[PDB]
Design a protein around this ligand. Sequence first.
Ligand code: 3PE
Ligand code: 3PE
Lengths: 98, 347, 171, 48, 169, 110, 105, 140, 120, 80
Amino acid sequence: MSLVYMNIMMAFTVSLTGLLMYRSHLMSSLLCLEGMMLSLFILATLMILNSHFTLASMMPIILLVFAACEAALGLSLLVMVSNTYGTDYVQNLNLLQC
Amino acid sequence: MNPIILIIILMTVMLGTIIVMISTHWLLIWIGFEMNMLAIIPIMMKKHNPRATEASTKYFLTQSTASMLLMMAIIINLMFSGQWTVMKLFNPMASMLMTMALAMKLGMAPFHFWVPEVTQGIPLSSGLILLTWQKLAPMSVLYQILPSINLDLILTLSILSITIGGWGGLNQTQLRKIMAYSSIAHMGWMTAVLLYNPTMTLLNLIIYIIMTSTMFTLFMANSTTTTLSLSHTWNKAPIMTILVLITLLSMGGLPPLSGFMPKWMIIQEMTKNDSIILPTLMAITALLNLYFYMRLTYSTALTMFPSTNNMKMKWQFPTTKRMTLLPTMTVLSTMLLPLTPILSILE
Amino acid sequence: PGIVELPSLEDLKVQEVKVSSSVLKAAAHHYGAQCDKPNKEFMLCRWEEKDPRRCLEEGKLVNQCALEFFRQIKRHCAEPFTEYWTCIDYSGLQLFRRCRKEQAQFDKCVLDKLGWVRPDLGELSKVTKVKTDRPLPENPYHSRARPEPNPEVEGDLKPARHGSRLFFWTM
Amino acid sequence: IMKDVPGWKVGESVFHTTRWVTPMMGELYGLRTGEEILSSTYGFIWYT
Amino acid sequence: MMTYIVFILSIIFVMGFVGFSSKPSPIYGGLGLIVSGGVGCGIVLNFGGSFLGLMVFLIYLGGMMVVFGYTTAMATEQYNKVVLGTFITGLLMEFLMVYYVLKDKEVEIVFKFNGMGDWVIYDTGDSGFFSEEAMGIAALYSYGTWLVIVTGWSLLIGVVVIMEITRGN
Amino acid sequence: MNLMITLLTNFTLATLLVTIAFWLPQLNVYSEKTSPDPMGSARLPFSMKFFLVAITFLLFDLEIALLLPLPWASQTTNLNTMLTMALLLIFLLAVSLAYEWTQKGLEWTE
Amino acid sequence: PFFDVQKKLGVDLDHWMTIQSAEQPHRIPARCHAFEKEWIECAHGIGSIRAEKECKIEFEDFRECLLRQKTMKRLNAIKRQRDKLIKEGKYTPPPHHSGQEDLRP
Amino acid sequence: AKTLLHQYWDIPEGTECHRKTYAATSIGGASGLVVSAYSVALKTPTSFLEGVARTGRYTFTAAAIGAIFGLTSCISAQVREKPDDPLNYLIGGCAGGLTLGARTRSYGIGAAACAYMGLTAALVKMGQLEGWKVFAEPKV
Amino acid sequence: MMTGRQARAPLQFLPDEARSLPPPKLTDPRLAYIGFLGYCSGLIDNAIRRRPVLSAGLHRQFLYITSFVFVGYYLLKRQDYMYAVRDHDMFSYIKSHPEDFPEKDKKTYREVFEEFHPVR
Amino acid sequence: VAAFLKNVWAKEPVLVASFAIAGLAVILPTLSPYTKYSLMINRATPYNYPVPLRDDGNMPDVPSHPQDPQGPSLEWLKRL
Ligand SMILES: CCCCCCCCCCCCCCCCCC(=O)OC[C@H](COP(=O)(O)OCCN)OC(=O)CCCCCCCCCCCCCCCCC
Ligand SMILES: CCCCCCCCCCCCCCCCCC(=O)OC[C@H](COP(=O)(O)OCCN)OC(=O)CCCCCCCCCCCCCCCCC
């Protein structure tokens, strides 16, 4: 198949490995998650436009809307834990080990 | 929390589950999943303490990762098939990604690390809602795509889930963590029998739902969240001790109780396909679940732990909790074995 | 698999309608009104056969009819048509509403010289009927034989023999 | 061109059917210069 | 090299993804994600999706990454070896993949990819007096009644949920 | 083609102007300054109001993205369905605004 | 469980999007309408097990329309042989393949 | 991991000691690498040196177990002239268990590992002989 | 397993072919056992709320028994129908494929040979 | 019911105007006699080709030429 498909898959894999290995902050995890969504957007849009599937052109808009609502919920959770601890570090979310 | 807002949010959770169940489009499956998760997040954060926000954060991160993997599998399937009908998949990579996404959503091992912490951090009612209702939609999606599921992957996930759940539940003293590890082992059983006869999976799902609902309803009726606070129940209401004894015996699969029927029919199905080592291993491993159930029954019903002075003050007042459907699911989770051929209604 | 068959370069040889887009647009309504029969025959052949190699001759006839249309325009109404397509060609979007006067002059000239009447609104968008002699393609998708369906359910439903036959249950 | 290679059939269709399929853009302009390729494929999108 | 414009843009896209995925700092990650989103919108525009690319600019970048950087400015108070190491190794795998693609005009990692320019897959015909993607999006109010209903209900419920969980009571 | 030429021209003109605006007084040798906000070292106070208005803007922006194809969608044959769906979407916008209004969401930044 | 609420109730909630060969606005055809139609007219009513083996050639044609790996490979081989012959100097390109053709219409 | 098992079972038993030992060592090293990867993931080490030392220790222990089992089973099949016999695999499993006890430096865990892994290796041999299926394909 | 059967007429508790089957009797032992389950649940409901078990609220226990009997009757109807469908499909497939189900050549014991293992 | 409208129109006139405009927008298209004109104007716009039908022999309604009397007419659109 095509080449830009390979580049978008590799971009998605890079963002997934970024999400799956936290460094210090929760915001970097959210950024990696939203980059994953952006790669999904580009891949689906290219496939739908190249395939001339007319009625599938509405799908990336719904995908963008739902994942941005997801991101709003995640930002609210990040703000709540930052108000609790004074920072958004992932090492402070360890009370539930016990 | 407003009663009306709570009502709207609960109907939104059920609406998301219904949208997943009834739809023939992959995008609608995805939409129902996000609607369900977005609506169920405030049920977890009903009490507004740091543990609930931590549990909600971990749950949100896990479900978002699983959802992105599911969308990846859907887009790969569209690329290699040009359609969106919810049926067998046309790519092994899409099948593997979707199977692991559904495993992450169900919390099966080795993606099990979020289940006990999330169950511990949230109240008993929201934990009941999670561990009972949240698992109806991924098992339905698995029920729709079984021609594309890799057998080795799903069987590995099943045996890993059963062993890890038993070994994890051996060490816990909190009731919610025990319920979480029990859930992990039961989903191991359910997805073990999935590829041979999914009707057995539906029967096991129904029986596990009823037994978990009974145990959680008894827990919120007595307002107990630890082992010792449950052990205080003999000096307050001994009928509840009898009920938790029979329900925990039935949860361990001991005949002639109704919990024996799912693993009995699962072993019956697995031996028809010349698989004998796996059902024996799963039974021997489920002995561990029986072990910590029997430890709970020792601490609660078959011995009298010392109580305190204020239990008299608690004697002078009756209970007023709405123990909804508690006798019905108490009866249905113990004396249902003579009605075993009723499983033909699920085919 | 097979070898795709293409017509030779002599079969694709025809003299073309070598006019620009605005020249075609100025006389588009009269071209649709006058040369409708071979155009609709070609379009019916095109939508039925789903193969341009089976519609090459109809396209050739379409070219011949269009060339004769423009030759008939050139014989009598060269100057008003030239002015009309010039003022059509000036416009960026090639509007029909910026050149009403020259359009009326060209229409009047071609009505009194050739008896041609331009169509009204919605006339050229009608669905017409075509009398042709080429036979209908009985299998235009080149589809092969469909698989035979499974046998269906027949007969009245009877109770199960000795019930469920599940272990010791007698029902 | 395709003469030296053994086992090559000139004009072999890739599909199992004899139905006419609309040619790819790379099937038409694949043997031509890059200017015509740019003017045909990206010509409409890039036009102002 | 001008026929490889979408391929070059995809290379810039994945390079920006490597850069922001190394997690140097949340604000620098946001900047890298903004640049990557702009390049991806360029990819979509060069493929023919004007409306979807302008949705990416209007909603993802102008409407949502603003919220991400706005929250990033309200935390992570203003003033490494790991970041440089992963950036270098990601650039190395990326350029190794490019060299292996362009040297042999074919590659297989999980699926099989072809190293020719991506102008080959395009359609040779015209769409008439309309654009196909605009008609497909516009069919949302005529065909996608159910999609509109579930999306609007999810958005309203999201408003209610966000108001519920940030109150603290 | 012409569009990205214009984009490059605007970008290089802006960066040329910024470079001249920065580095031209750098050629001056004026002086060296030591220089030893009303708040000295106070932490930025986290305000829920600004985050709330940001999230409300984001959600309304999403429903705006839903509302955007209305001029194209008005050309459909199914006019009753399109009118009903458009009115339902803007009614959901109004209902979300009213729920934010009544529950003191727009408070102290009204 | 897949509760077919739509078939029981007669509503059409997501069947319009579910395939590419369905009813599209303004009668716009897709690139692989014919191949998908032939594959669906195969697989209808025989189950997945029979349709995975019986007329698989329709699905191979559909997949070749969708992704076009064989056409890309054939073009790659033709262009590679052309490049080798051009470099070794025993092939001269024709005038119409170098931009000196003055195309038909 | 599929090709390692086939390349181990392609060699006839009691025929090539070196190649059987090499295949068993490769399988053991792969399993030890998986165990070490999960160990350094879930239980993070104090430094890079501690993590690489733990990785080397686990991989070497598993590889030594595999090599000892393969060599002992192949030698016992060669001596006894009984290639298809689970007693040779029982002897090899006990040898691997004793190697595990030697690596951990305690006698009791070594004896228990001898008994249990000898029984396990014997069961694997019986399953290979009788065609027992562990991940059985659906049939009915 | 039987989704192809329950695919042409979905979401039906009891299709029209089920009415050709004999309904369960009201003296069915399974129905009586389900009524006993309802009575036991009524007694537990009396017990957990600290009421006299066998005396308090006879209307509640009667509604428990009635509800259990109703739901159990309909479930039993569905169960009998689905086993009937199973047998019908099995016999139709056996009759339609005679090559795969040959008649076994039965032999009397005077011709068959069985090894004898003495117990001594 | 009557003084409430006067009070709310003296106090919040912006909300009164908004709700009145909304009510007009939601009840007027169901009441106007020009909605059918919008319907048959949108459905009479020729986006794609009117593919002809093969003449079997029985189509008196279908014209054989655009200028033939039979067929749909847009005189109502030309006059309105
Ligand atoms: C193939 C299968 C397809 C699907 C088939 C159907 C599946 C049904 C699955 C049922 C899942 C139940 C989920 C959990 C209960 C949902 C209702 C709820 O929200 O309950 C919690 C609620 C919280 O209120 P609150 O007052 O805060 O409680 C704290 C204690 N004071 O209220 C309370 O806590 C009140 C206290 C009593 C709660 C009792 C709830 C019982 C629910 C389970 C009933 C039995 C299962 C359903 C029937 C059998 C299904 C197989
Ligand atoms: C049904 C029609 C279509 C409906 C959907 C479309 C609606 C479009 C407009 C959307 C408006 C969204 C926001 C609405 C908020 C209303 C609630 C509100 O603000 O109540 C508070 C306000 C009193 O103000 P206060 O409490 O002091 O707040 C600080 C500001 N002063 O309270 C008030 O000022 C009183 C507000 C309620 C009464 C308004 C009555 C208007 C009547 C107009 C004539 C009738 C129009 C026809 C429709 C029927 C209306 C009942």
